[PDB]
C-alpha cells in the first residue's frame, strides 16, 4: 500500500471554489478538549487511500 497520497477526511466548513487548505491541526470531532493530542474525538485531519 502506497501511503504518500492523502485526502482531508473532515473540516469545520466547506471549501470555497479553488480554495486551497494545507493546515494539519488536530480536528476536535466532539466534546473532548483535544489540546493538539491524538485520542477519542481528537484526530489528525488527513487520511490515505494506501
Amino acid at each position: 500500500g502506497n501511503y504518500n497520497y492523502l485526502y482531508r477526511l473532515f473540516r469545520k466548513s466547506n471549501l470555497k471554489p479553488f480554495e486551497r487548505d494545507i493546515s494539519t491541526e488536530i480536528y476536535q470531532a466532539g466534546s473532548t478538549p483535544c489540546n493538539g493530542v491524538k485520542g477519542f474525538n481528537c484526530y489528525f485531519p488527513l487520511q490515505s487511500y494506501g
Partner: protein, 50 residues
C-alpha cells in the same frame, strides 16, 4: 452470541440519537466506513441493524 452465529437487533420506528455513542469514551474503538459518525444525527433510514 459466539461470532460464528452473530446476533442482529432490528432498529425501527424510533429516534436514533447517536450522541450518547459519540461521547461513549469507554468504547475501545468506534470506527465508521462510508459515513462520518458525527453526521449520523442528521440522517434518516428505512431499517437500521446492530
Amino acid at each position: 452470541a459466539s461470532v460464528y452465529a452473530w446476533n442482529r437487533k432490528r432498529i425501527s420506528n424510533c429516534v436514533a440519537d447517536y450522541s450518547v455513542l459519540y461521547n461513549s469514551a469507554s468504547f475501545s474503538t468506534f470506527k465508521c466506513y462510508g459515513v462520518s459518525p458525527t453526521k449520523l444525527n442528521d440522517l434518516c433510514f428505512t431499517n437500521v441493524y446492530a
